[model samples]
Target: ASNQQDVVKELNQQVANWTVAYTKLHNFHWYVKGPNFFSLHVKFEELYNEASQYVDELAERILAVGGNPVGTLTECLEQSIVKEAAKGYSAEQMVEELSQDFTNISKQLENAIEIAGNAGDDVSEDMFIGMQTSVDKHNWMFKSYLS
Candidate 1:
């Protein structure tokens, strides 16, 4: 058994990642320029809204588990697997990057789910399961929006 500490560790990592994701989405929202501006702008806001909640939920989950959440932008940058947005991405590149970024997170979620389950952490496992379902749809929609 991996233990609760392992599950908490994964949850903290997710908290950090979502924090970065939320910021990056905002960057895309404000800076994205091109033919698809209206659509991409609205979608970026929507995505960031969701990401903001993910950060809060995961952070609260850490508290619920008696673990400390990653609370600083520096901590978010230091701990997250998700990278900050590249400043020069075109609208198409923004879409492509988000699609790929979400895929990366889903993969990590798979491992987090396993870690949670192995440790018998039902709350954390279900949290990731719900997020996984949401992201799969997001990934599909973004992919479909591509060529």
Candidate 2:
């Protein structure tokens, strides 16, 4: 690895990860209904807001490294592994799916952290560190939803 950071590479992936989380959170919030609907909608919005921050931070970090952050819905859709839920989904189903996705994202961020740290990319590590904390909180929220 060169002294030149691969911020684009990492940022691209970060964008993808957040897209999955953000979109799903919003979807769940919108479709949510039943006993816990109101509570879950607010919580999902909070989680989505957190995800939005990460998207911005990672993009800024990429720019700081003299790289361009990928933009456009096409780019996001192509790059992201977060599956799109077909047009209509019930709140409970959305919650179940999103909770699982949140857990998966935490695992993925751990892998990203390992890669960034081992590569001696302090900037990337810091980005991932903040993201990890947020992701953990989201996971906890989701788990509490279940319990």
Candidate 3:
């Protein structure tokens, strides 16, 4: 409703989003199988690495705003729109699911950045910019696997 309220909500939401991305990338990395084992493993590792850093940065930003970041697995699951992939997926399935996740994340980050910008939260804007670029890069790579 108010300025402080919305900004805090957005920061928490962003943190939750990053948490989902981090965990999902790890999930894919762990379960990816079939022909492209080595390739997908390394790629998922890179994606998760960036996602982990994003989670840290976003949580720190939330803390700086005096808002608590969603910490537990349950908390992020409750807050994020991203869904978990079932274990034992084929490499192609992993790529498809992860590509969808990255695309969704890119859209969400764009919205979050817009909200932050409108609220005059420069820190969130900058954080979202960094996140947006990273997600886009991951999405590009993931999409490349499809085409």
Candidate 4:
């Protein structure tokens, strides 16, 4: 809302990243197989649900700043840092990938928050900081599972 175009772009990219992560998590939920099946299935479902919500939140934040949120699949793929999986993943691989994705998102949000602050957009800065915290928590949880 502070005439910060860069902040808007950063927010839109976050929306894209969240959208990609949601799709990947959904894939993991449906395809995960192993001794940890039941627990991992529920965890994947929970993570994908959270990712979907975060996507919505990021989109709304973009709108709040007078920016158009990227909604098309093509645009999302282009802007997203998260890459799609080409094949099914082992339980161990899934957890590792998810943990790495969370780390990536947290770093992106950190940079976005700093950019917002540089632009004098306190609201955007605060929003990104909050999301960063959530992503950090997710990263820790996923990493712990692998460890």
For each candidate, what is the lDDT? Answer: 0.91, 0.75, 0.80, 0.87
Instruction: For residues 1-147, write the lDDT of model 1, one tens digit per residue.
Output: 778899889998888888999989999999999888999899999998998888889889989989899889998899898899877998888889889988999999999999999999999999999998999899999999896
- Per-candidate TM equals 0.97, 0.86, 0.90, 0.94
lDDT-superior candidate, 2 or 4: 4
Output the TM-score of candidate 3.
Answer: 0.90
Instruction: Find the 10 residues in a row with the least total lDDT in model 2.
Output: 1-10
Q: Which candidate is the best by TM-score?
A: 1
lDDT by residue (tens digit), candidate 4, 33-128 = 999999999998998888888788878878887889999989999999999975868999999988888888888888888899999988888989
In candidate 1, stretches whose alpha carbon ends up further than 4 angstroms from where it belongs are none
RMSD of 3: 1.7
Q: In lDDT terms, how accurate is model 4?
A: 0.87
Per-residue CA lDDT of candidate 2, range 37-107, in tens? Answer: 77888988988898888898888877887877877767887777677776677766776777777777777
Better of 1 and 4 by TM-score: 1
Q: Clashes in model 3: which pairs?
A: none
Better of 3 and 4 by lDDT: 4
List RMSD in Å for every model shown: 0.9, 2.2, 1.7, 1.9
Q: Give the TM-score (vs. native) of candidate 4.
A: 0.94
Candidate 2: which stretches are off by over 4 Å?
A: 1-7
